[PDB]
Design an enzyme around this catalytic site. Structure first.
Site, PDB file in Angstrom:
ATOM      1  N   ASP A 161      -4.502 -42.102  17.007  1.00  0.00           N
ATOM      2  CA  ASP A 161      -3.227 -42.751  17.306  1.00  0.00           C
ATOM      3  C   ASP A 161      -3.445 -44.222  17.713  1.00  0.00           C
ATOM      4  OD1 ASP A 161      -0.177 -41.980  17.814  1.00  0.00           O
ATOM      5  OD2 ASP A 161      -0.775 -43.114  19.604  1.00  0.00           O
ATOM      6  N   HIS A 207      -0.021 -33.624  14.779  1.00  0.00           N
ATOM      7  CA  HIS A 207      -0.586 -34.930  15.096  1.00  0.00           C
ATOM      8  C   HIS A 207      -1.832 -34.925  15.970  1.00  0.00           C
ATOM      9  CE1 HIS A 207      -0.514 -39.194  16.195  1.00  0.00           C
ATOM     10  NE2 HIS A 207      -0.355 -38.870  17.467  1.00  0.00           N
TER      11      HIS A 207
END
Lengths: 289, 289
Positions: free
Chosen positions: B107, B270
């Site tokens: 991320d 994610h």
């Protein structure tokens, strides 16, 4: 106590199959319905309504779920807060007063109700004015980095519940006042009557009213967009004589959506009837008469 | 707060912009791990042990995140730009005597990592990025669908204090909803509860939330501009690279940005190192070996 900003206007609570619509009603002559947007209520028309009432029977209505209108229960498709549904409900309300063919001006969300009404039920309208909008389809087609940053709230308020509702809960006064200020020319609240700001603030302070506003933007991201998409990909145009007013191409856009449209800029931020009441009232009086 | 890294030491590393906190374990070639939003170094707790079997593993809090110091920001959000963060972490690694190292990021940390690779490729032996595309690409893709799906890229980038103000009302709710929303399961069940408490504690501090917003502001502005220069110049990362992503095109995209890259989907949302620790650890070990 909340101010009466429409001296001499009556009040009506009009029944519909989806709940009551609150309105202030004044003047005499051909019928003209006025529809507000977000994050406001019917009182945003208080600076131009007396002028209009000199020539028309003016109906100043709270949108379904806004102000003092009832809040119909929503569903997974946000149906009652779609502009198609809101238009149908306001058509029902106008029939209660005996108006089946009338003039219409809308601002912001109310303007979206208005052009959708014109697309679905053109026979209901003699003439149409839309203030500081393009069709919802056009806003989403224009979506890129710059637009996403500029009107972030279209995507933020459309997130599934309860995300925006919980974010708005902590300090609602701050959010609603920042939005009001943000979209004016001056970037503060100086354009507004403080009594009108208090109407807006009191509405936004009710979590049920805030939930309606989010359902409105959820409709704006989904069903409203899809309804518009059908029309544009068919080449359907509004046949009703139309006026587009906007604050500081819009006419080129509306010419794609409407076959008899005229338009003009008004030197204002977003809130035309409060920031530029004299120019806005003159434009509307000239067009509708 | 629990110790989730058995055997690992705890270090504060000095830099010209403030201290970087890291957990440090293992021996062998040096490997830096960088977390993202809304997390801290502890997101690596499931995979760090397997890595420490073969590497000296440095698990760092990003500048301004976790227990790292928070440098004062400015109007261009400079210290929370990925270029600046990468410079600060290069300084931290020099304090340990590491001037050539392996790097994996997730991320925001993966964005620091590919920016580091573009600016200072001589610093890296190998690079892994987890569940990202370059910031430029995500903005180029920002149409209606993406504006709704990754709304927080535009919301968190709004000028201060708008998101700071909203996030202050119920931060625990917001951070836990982000964590859940982005997993395959759609709840918190992929996370160790002790890890979630680390994330919650960090997010509870207004100063830490403000850093996060500065990170997304950099993401919308200077980070985008820095990436745009590279795309226009045709610059590619020369460092051997791995791109992993959650299955709930990416290799096609990274091949436009890097001349030596492999990649694979992982059965995961994610948060790869927590939702799919075994597969993620194996892919990383095999790559960096």
């Amino acid at each position: 106590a909340l101010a009466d900003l429409f001296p001499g206007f009556g009040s009506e609570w009009i029944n519909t199959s989806s709940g009551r619509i609150f309105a202030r009603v004044g003047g005499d002559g051909p019928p003209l319905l006025l529809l507000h947007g977000f994050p406001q209520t019917h009182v945003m028309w208080h600076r131009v309504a007396p002028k209009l009432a000199e020539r028309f029977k003016v109906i100043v209505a709270d949108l379904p779920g806004y102000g003092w209108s009832d809040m119909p229960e929503s569903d997974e498709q946000h149906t009652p807060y779609t502009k198609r549904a809101m238009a149908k409900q306001l058509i029902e309300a106008m029939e209660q007063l005996g108006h089946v063919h009338f003039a219409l001006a809308g601002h912001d969300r109310g303007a979206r109700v208005s052009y959708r009404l014109a697309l679905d039920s053109p026979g209901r309208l003699s003439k149409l004015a839309v203030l500081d909008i393009l069709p919802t389809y056009e806003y989403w087609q224009r979506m890129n980095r710059a637009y996403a940053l500029k009107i972030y709230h279209w995507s933020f308020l459309a997130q599934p519940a309860p995300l925006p509702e919980n974010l708005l809960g902590g300090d609602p006064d701050f959010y609603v006042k920042a939005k009001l200020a943000s979209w004016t020319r001056a970037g503060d609240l100086s354009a507004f009557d403080p009594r009108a700001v208090e109407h807006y603030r009191i509405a936004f302070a009710d979590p049920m009213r805030r939930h309606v506003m989010c359902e409105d933007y959820r409709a704006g991201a989904y069903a409203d967009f899809e309804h518009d998409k059908i029309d544009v990909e068919a080449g359907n145009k509004i046949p009703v004589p139309m006026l587009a007013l906007w604050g500081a191409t819009p006419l080129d856009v509306w010419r794609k959506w409407a076959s008899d449209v005229q338009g003009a800029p008004i030197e204002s931020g977003h809130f035309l009837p409060e920031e530029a009441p004299d120019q806005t009232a003159e434009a509307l009086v000239r067009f509708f008469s």
